Symmetry: C3
Subunit: 85 residues, 3 copies
């Protein structure tokens, strides 16, 4: 599916936007929503990366880094964009 | 699947989604509609799930463009349909 | 069900929920509890899933009506049950 892998990228840009101002919880919820949308597509190589990004938020952004978790979210978004093209 | 037991929580979620959509909050309303969709996948039903998915895509398209009125209208229509499905 | 690193995620989400409920934000606490439920249904624990659903419904019903202390108590009991399950 190509029309449901562009909503994931649209949420992954809000996630980074929140992560750049300390909104770790809202970014967590956005990534959870993206995982929920990715569970509905036929892709089983981008859902795992989204789960990795969510766990990255949990174990890397709540401790005050906020620079590396954003990087993991950017890597996930770039992987999804590479996949849709 | 739901007789104003698990189908009335969706209405209380949609109301807060509409309230969020009013002032400026597209993202919180989107998250609320996603929660309502997650609730609707458990309480059986097929029409409510589709209408809530339509409302979610409506949030995504209309709300972030700047047309909050259209997104509020679509979520209101979905809430009214869900309310008329529990009667 | 999914033991550590799957249930501690739920515990941390419940801690965030309790933090939010003490300030007055019922909608964000609702969303994070829904996220914690979504983390369940994957670990394999069913009692934990049922208690998370109980906590979600409790947060809605009793905290949207201004009784935040009792909703915080219910979420604390849910978190204590999940912690007692990982040990
Ligand atoms: Zn989460
Ligand atoms: Zn969404
Ligand atoms: Zn909820």
């Amino acid at each position: 599916t190509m029309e449901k892998l562009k909503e994931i990228v649209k949420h992954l840009e809000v996630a980074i936007k929140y992560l750049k101002e300390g909104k770790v919880d809202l970014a967590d919820l956005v990534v959870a929503d993206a995982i929920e949308l990715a569970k509905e597509a036929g892709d089983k190589a981008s859902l795992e990366i989204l789960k990795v990004a969510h766990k990255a938020i949990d174990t890397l952004g709540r401790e005050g880094k906020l620079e590396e978790a954003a990087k993991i979210v950017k890597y996930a978004k770039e992987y999804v964009e590479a996949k849709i093209k």
